[PDB]
Amino acid sequence: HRRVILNEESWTRVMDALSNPPSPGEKLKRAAKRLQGM
């Protein structure tokens, strides 16, 4: 329910996630394949 996200060192974690985006894991890939054909 947060429209104003106020960060601190969480800011660097988000900045790092933007410059080095995580590779989608198997769990999420399964969810995406289940969603594809529905």
Partner: protein, 160 residues
């Protein structure tokens, strides 16, 4: 399968009273606040239902546009503030399928107006673990209940 994921329909009726996800707060939100908050534009509500005229809801999620800022810059984003799956469906991976639906909505919206990521609210350790297993980056301290997923990772999910 008989189930479908769709955005709440403005002039449609839904069977919600029977819904039970195990969390009393998420139930009451669905049966007393979800429909009016969607129709009053406070959030965008998406429903997992049985694709029958009766429209039996077996899960839901809510989205709203946001921005992340530090105590300098700004991050145009979308927050997934609520996620609930009915007890009858639990164990089949419907929670993860709803997050993937959410991510696809957020991705389409980034392609249109430019949104750099998805933030999620985890009110307990069970949800925090769930969002971590989906690849969300856990935030710390004051933002301990928030997890982040960038748009570039969402693009990777539906392009590779």
């Amino acid at each position: 399968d008989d189930l479908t994921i769709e955005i709440l329909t403005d002039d449609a009726d839904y069977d919600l009273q029977r819904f039970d996800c195990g969390e009393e707060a998420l139930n009451l939100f669905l049966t007393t606040h979800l429909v009016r908050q969607h129709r009053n534009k406070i959030l965008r509500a998406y429903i997992l239902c049985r694709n029958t005229p009766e429209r039996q809801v077996l899960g839901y999620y809510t989205l709203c546009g946001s921005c992340f800022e530090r105590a300098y810059k700004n991050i145009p984003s979308v927050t997934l503030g609520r996620l609930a799956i009915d007890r009858s469906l639990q164990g089949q991976g419907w929670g993860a399928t709803l997050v993937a639906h959410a991510m696809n909505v957020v991705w389409s919206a980034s392609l249109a107006v430019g949104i750099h990521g998805l933030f999620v609210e985890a009110l307990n350790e069970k949800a925090h673990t769930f969002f971590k297993s989906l690849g969300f980056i856990p935030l710390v301290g004051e933002n301990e209940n928030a997890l982040f997923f960038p748009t570039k990772s969402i693009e990777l999910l539906f392009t590779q």
